[PDB]
Amino acid sequence: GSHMQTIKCVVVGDGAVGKTCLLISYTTNKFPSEYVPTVFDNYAVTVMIGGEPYTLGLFDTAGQEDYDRLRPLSYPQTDVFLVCFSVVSPSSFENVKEKWVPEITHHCPKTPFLLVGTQIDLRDDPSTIEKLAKNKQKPITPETAEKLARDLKAVKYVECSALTQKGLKNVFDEAILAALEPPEPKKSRRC
Amino acid sequence: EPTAEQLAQIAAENEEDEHSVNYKPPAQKSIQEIQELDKDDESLRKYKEALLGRVAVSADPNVPNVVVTRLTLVCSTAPGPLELDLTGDLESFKKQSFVLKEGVEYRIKISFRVNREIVSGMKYIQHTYRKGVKIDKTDYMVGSYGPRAEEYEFLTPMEEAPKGMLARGSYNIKSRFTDDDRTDHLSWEWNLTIKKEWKD
Numbered sequence: 001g002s003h004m005q006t007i008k009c010v011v012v013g014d015g016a017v018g019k020t021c022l023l024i025s026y027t028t029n030k031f032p033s034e035y036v037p038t039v040f041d042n043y044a045v046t047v048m049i050g051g052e053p054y055t056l057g058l059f060d061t062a063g064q065e066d067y068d069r070l071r072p073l074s075y076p077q078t079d080v081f082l083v084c085f086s087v088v089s090p091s092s093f094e095n096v097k098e099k100w101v102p103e104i105t106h107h108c109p110k111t112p113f114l115l116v117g118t119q120i121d122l123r124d125d126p127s128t129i130e131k132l133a134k135n136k137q138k139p140i141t142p143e144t145a146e147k148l149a150r151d152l153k154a155v156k157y158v159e160c161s162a163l164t165q166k167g168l169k170n171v172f173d174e175a176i177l178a179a180l181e182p183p184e185p186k187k188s189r190r191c
Numbered sequence: 192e193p194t195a196e197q198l199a200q201i202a203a204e205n206e207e208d209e210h211s212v213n214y215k216p217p218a219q220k221s222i223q224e225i226q227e228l229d230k231d232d233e234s235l236r237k238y239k240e241a242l243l244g245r246v247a248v249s250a251d252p253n254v255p256n257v258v259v260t261r262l263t264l265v266c267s268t269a270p271g272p273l274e275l276d277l278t279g280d281l282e283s284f285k286k287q288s289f290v291l292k293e294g295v296e297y298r299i300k301i302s303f304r305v306n307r308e309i310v311s312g313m314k315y316i317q318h319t320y321r322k323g324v325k326i327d328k329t330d331y332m333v334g335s336y337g338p339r340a341e342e343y344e345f346l347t348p349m350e351e352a353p354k355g356m357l358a359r360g361s362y363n364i365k366s367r368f369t370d371d372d373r374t375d376h377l378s379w380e381w382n383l384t385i386k387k388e389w390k391d
């Protein structure tokens with residue numbers, strides 16, 4: 001039959017937002033209890049979608065300002081980006097529009113991407129909501145995110161919890177589908 | 192009648208496609224500096240190793256950080272090869288007859304080589320002139336790359352060639368390879384010609 005296609009998926013976002021845990025959670029199914037590395041190693045997994053095998057290559061990033069020069073070295077040839085932000089952390093959600101999207105659209109023009117709401121379990125949690133509603137800041141909602149996503153022209157908006165694995169398997173399933181959709185030129189040189 | 196001064200109307204593209212919250216170039220750090228930032232973190236060292244590879248750094252004096260070798264026109268319909276040796280004499284390109292059949296889909300194969308440091312967000316800017324008039328601005332992002340012995344080969348997306356029923360003339364092309372640091376690695380000019388047939 002046909003050759004197995006590879007999908008290169010790159011995950012971006014600020015520090016501690018959950019890029020790493022989301023990846024180990026997805027590839028082992030077990031959330032990282034004790035140990036959690038700065039960066040998850042480059043990894044590949046066969047994923048079945050619409051009846052076809054796909055080698056999904058996963059790429060975790062070092063989102064610190066110290067690595068704004070190193071990080072893009074993984075960007076070339078990317079098929080899809082996953083810009084992530086914690087729901088109980090507006091600081092990241094903001095940085096999405098400021099740093100992230102421009103960084104990826106700068107380096108990979110016609111490359112699709114999705115917005116990822118990490119830690120959805122915290123949308124409803126004591127201690128976290130505690131410090132939130134205090135400093136005039138409340139948890140993000142699908143409606144809120146979908147607005148920013150469409151504004152940013154993100155293929156879609158998806159959310160999940162690396163803790164409760166709710167929506168995880170789905171994030172990568174949409175990641176795959178998002179990467180399969182044809183380019184669409186829009187670069188008409190004729191006049 | 193091939194062309195007039197209706198070239199200015201062709202600028203129904205030009206600059207207006209900017210409208211974006213600007214990127215912001217990254218600091219001018221360096222490999223050795225990158226290498227010493229978090230030696231304590233095993234995970235990060237694995238991360239730098241995958242991206243930066245390991246060892247092999249030759250000529251430091253004479254050789255610059257980036258050195259584009261050539262630009263190749265990848266086309267299945269093109270009978271004869273189309274390249275440009277971006278090494279040495281460039282004035283030669285100011286008197287060549289580069290034919291490109293109209294309407295054909297094609298793409299560019301950029302062949303460069305990084306030597307010492309990182310090249311952050313390297314791009315290929317192409318300016319198409321007809322009768323001295325700039326009728327097209329185009330940016331092809333190549334991205335950031337690390338130093339290595341083996342050369343890199345980047346391919347631009349598939350694009351279509353214009354239909355000659357009108358603009359089938361000869362153009363003056365100005366090109367350069369810059370980056371996020373405004374460094375001008377290379378700059379040259381050459382002439383291209385559209386026609387109705389391949390090598391007519």
Ligand SMILES: Nc1nc2c(ncn2[C@@H]2O[C@H](COP(=O)(O)OP(=O)(O)O)[C@@H](O)[C@H]2O)c(=O)[nH]1
Nearest residue numbers: 014015016017018019020021036119161162163
């Ligand atoms: N409750 C909770 N904590 C999480 C989840 N994901 C990551 N964390 C914790 O959040 C912190 C930072 O997440 P991490 O994935 O390392 O962030 P990264 O810098 O984006 O990789 C760690 O202390 C994790 O244990 C989650 O889904 N629920």
Ligand SMILES: *C/C=C(\C)CC/C=C(\C)CC/C=C(\C)CCC=C(C)C
Nearest residue numbers: 189190191264273299319327353358
């Ligand atoms: C409406 C535009 C018209 C009428 C003409 C503009 C001409 C273009 C845009 C030509 C592009 C030529 C390229 C990209 C050259 C590629 C050839 C090599 C890389 C050998």
Ligand SMILES: [Mg+2]
Nearest residue numbers: 002003004005
């Ligand atoms: Mg094949």
Ligand SMILES: [Mg+2]
Nearest residue numbers: 019020038039
């Ligand atoms: Mg991480």
